Design brief:
The structure is cut from a larger assembly and holds chains A and B. Chain A is mainly β. Chain A has no helices and four strands. In chain A, strands 2-1-4-3 form a four-stranded antiparallel sheet, with no helix packed on it. Chain B is extended, with a radius of gyration of 35 Å. The chains are: A mainly beta, B mainly alpha. Chain B: This is Mitochondrial SSU ribosomal protein.
Chain lengths: 74, 590
Amino acid sequence: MFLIHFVHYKTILQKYTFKFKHIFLSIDKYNSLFFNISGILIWLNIIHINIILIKYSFFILINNFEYLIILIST
Amino acid sequence: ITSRGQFNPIHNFSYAMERGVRARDVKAFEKLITNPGPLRVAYTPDYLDWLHRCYKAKGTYMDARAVAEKKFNGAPPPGMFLRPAHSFRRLAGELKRRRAQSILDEVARAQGMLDLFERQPHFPAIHIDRCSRFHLVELFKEMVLERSLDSNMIWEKALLYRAILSERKPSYPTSFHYIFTAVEDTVFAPTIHPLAAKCPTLEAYYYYVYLVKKYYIDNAVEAHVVLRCHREPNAADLLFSNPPPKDDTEIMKAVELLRNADIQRGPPVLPGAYPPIDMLWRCEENLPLLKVLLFGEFNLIVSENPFVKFPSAHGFLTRPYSTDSSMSLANVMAEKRGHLLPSLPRNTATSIDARAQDIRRLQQKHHRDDIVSFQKLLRTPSAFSSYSDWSYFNPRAVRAEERDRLTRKAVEALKLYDSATNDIYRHSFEDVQACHTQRVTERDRTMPPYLPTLPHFVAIIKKDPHISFLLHIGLPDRNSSEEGSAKHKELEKRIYYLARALYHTALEYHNETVRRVNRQKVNVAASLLDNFVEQEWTTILRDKDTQNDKKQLARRLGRYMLFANRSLDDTGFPTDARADDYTRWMAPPS
């Protein structure tokens, strides 16, 4: 039987906060140092030189993977 | 319930309308409104209209309610259903309504009666033509006598009313004529003797005539002002009137003329003593004078501001304006600061004197404009309301408290009337079927056993070992000695303050602005309590071993934890939160 009619209180208080980072926030990426390329030399069958900026080059990279390439002041 | 310029019924229409007596024509209604018994209440046309309309509406109401109940052999709120008659809940509800409505009715009429003998404008004239010694004496002892502090002022009041009635005779309306019978019929004690102890002297009467003629008194109101100011050392100054008073040559001449003209029909000093008050009410001889007195109070009261006519008496009768000035500030501040502090550096002295002047200027500048703006702001419930704020001065104005008591009684009655709604009417059955689907659960779905309630906090701050010790044992006994009762009162009072503060913080906890302020109230309260406890504790320990005595018991309790440095949240319990967080929440306002 029913004796009464009432209004339904509830305590919805969130007072605690637990947020956990999903895994992919910590995954790696590939980051690189970046300087302005002053020049480039490519050689595979035939050598080719491109010069963007002529200055005394303070750093030089050599990379052999497919074609021989030399990145000047890179 | 009443506000300024509200109409209230002094009639009971309900009694006759339940018997089935109803009026149709306006003549019938006028016949309904006239008291047979001695008193005659006149009305403004306006109030009379309002009352008429109300009457008609009550006719229609009782009619439609009765017709509804003859058809069924009230009308529910929108989503509701009528419980059966002869159901306990409905019987209770209806009972509640009967009682509440009787209360509201009585209150309405009581406030009407207050209006009637406070001489509100819509009750322009109370006529006494039909009264006999009983009615007159009783009216006198309830209205005039009881209220008055001073006995001797009543006589003055009487003679001055006699003088005003006698001098203003042409301008009065026809309905007043009867009262003049009583004026010519007044009995005076012979000039200097059986009536000497019973009645006042003619000399006196002519003094008051001098006053009506010299100050142009038209009213019971200006009467009131004059009668309060005239015996005082500054009299000429207080009572100096805006149209300036006539020169005493003409006046004393016209008084000579009246005195003489009234002899052939059969600077005057303020008069002497009069016979003891009782004579006035209990001697047949004074009966006409008494009559005048009553007529003087219940009529002769007009709206007008007496302080247009007597602009200098406003400060004396009612309080003066604060913007109106009747040493240097620096010297005052020096006097408060005492001799134990350095005298103000004379930079700051000079600076403060400068402010004192600028403030003087602000006062003088805003004095008029504030007054004007204030009345204009009142003429426009609304923020501005009251029992009495009226522009005009009423010497019989009712005490605010009598009206407030009624109002409070009426608001209880209203809440009672509102209760019964849920007893008489009910929700749809299946709505409560639905409602019982979500059960009440102890843990979540029920409100927590600690709500903000004053005894919850009083208990919390009395639950502390040190304060519990101070209350019971520590202080010298409350009944035994005087220091005991004194200390006890103060400890209790301080607990109480800190409790009220915590409580009001708990209620408003959610809204930031109010919470920071209430928080400052907690700080002040707790600081007071802490200083009292600390002091009394030191006293206990110093005051001049034996096993388990007072001092040992005290030293066992340890260090007293200050209520200031306590961190209690909304529920009156110490916080879950980190100290840095709690501190930030409760920080002072800016």
